Amino acid sequence: LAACPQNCHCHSDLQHVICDKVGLQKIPKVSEKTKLLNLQRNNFPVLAANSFRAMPNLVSLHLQHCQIREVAAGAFRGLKQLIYLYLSHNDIRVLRAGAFDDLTELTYLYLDHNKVTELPRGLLSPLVNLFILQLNNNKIRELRAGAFQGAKDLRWLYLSENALSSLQPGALDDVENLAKFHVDRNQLSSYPSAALSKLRVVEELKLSHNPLKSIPDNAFQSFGRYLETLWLDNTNLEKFSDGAFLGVTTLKHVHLENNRLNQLPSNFPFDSLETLALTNNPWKCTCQLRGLRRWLEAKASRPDATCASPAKFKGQHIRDTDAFRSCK
Ligand SMILES: [Cl-]
Ligand code: NI
Numbered sequence: 001l002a003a004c005p006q007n008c009h010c011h012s013d014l015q016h017v018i019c020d021k022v023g024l025q026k027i028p029k030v031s032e033k034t035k036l037l038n039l040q041r042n043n044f045p046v047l048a049a050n051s052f053r054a055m056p057n058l059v060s061l062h063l064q065h066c067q068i069r070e071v072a073a074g075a076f077r078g079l080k081q082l083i084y085l086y087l088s089h090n091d092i093r094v095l096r097a098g099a100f101d102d103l104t105e106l107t108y109l110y111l112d113h114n115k116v117t118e119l120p121r122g123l124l125s126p127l128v129n130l131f132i133l134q135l136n137n138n139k140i141r142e143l144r145a146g147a148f149q150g151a152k153d154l155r156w157l158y159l160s161e162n163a164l165s166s167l168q169p170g171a172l173d174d175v176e177n178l179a180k181f182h183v184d185r186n187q188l189s190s191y192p193s194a195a196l197s198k199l200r201v202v203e204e205l206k207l208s209h210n211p212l213k214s215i216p217d218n219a220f221q222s223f224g225r226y227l228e229t230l231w232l233d234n235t236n237l238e239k240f241s242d243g244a245f246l247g248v249t250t251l252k253h254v255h256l257e258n259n260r261l262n263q264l265p266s267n268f269p270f271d272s273l274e275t276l277a278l279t280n281n282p283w284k285c286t287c288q289l290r291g292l293r294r295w296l297e298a299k300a301s302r303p304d305a306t307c308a309s310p311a312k313f314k315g316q317h318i319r320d321t322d323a324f325r326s327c328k
Pocket of ligand 1 (some may be wrong): 010011012
């Protein structure tokens, strides 16, 4: 009785149902053996409760570009086997708790390029298996305590190009296994110490394009034994505090380009450092920069930049200049 829907293209004996831009106004009825349902580029302004009934074997659901504005509570009830959910490129503003009920198995959730403004408590509570939460290009302004409550195994959190200006203490307490954290291109006017101080296994921290101005003491200590990649490019960075890199023991990749740095802290970790972007900084070629000098001459392929001061060595390259001869 159940066959491929009208104007749709089915594959793998009705296991894959593709309805790409076919003028749908309602969720079509599909066979119970459906495992992949692509409803991209249709029109579903409101996803009501039980919008996907009788799809117990569905593992991948694609709903991008569907002009979706609201996801009602229990919109995805029954999808106990769903692994992928794409809600990217819609007009979602309202996203309340219950919207993600029954999504016990969901591992990848894409909500990027929407109009979400907040992440209320309990919204992600059912998502105990979520690994990637892609929320880039929204309008979230603030993360508060319990914003990620229930997200037990969240590893990658994408929040690039939002309007974040505040991370409350306790905001990330629920995401202990967090490895990737992208909050570049936001409104962070200071390093969110309190929020990050609770995480221990962060490996990549992307903070580019935030007016951070400076990095405080113990900025990375909590997760200092796991931090491998750090982006601080275009953060209007004037300097690092003396204790900023306390407990950092395996940092491999750093991006500092496009800032106002003249110096580096004495405890700057060069021991595990592999790549370091440092162009477009008014570097001061004095004694305190010898550590960077010693690192650059340890492997020739490592790019460098030019000193803005002192006057004698203005414009010379860090690796070529004679500004470090009078210190040993
Ligand atoms: Cl086919
Ligand atoms: Ni096919």
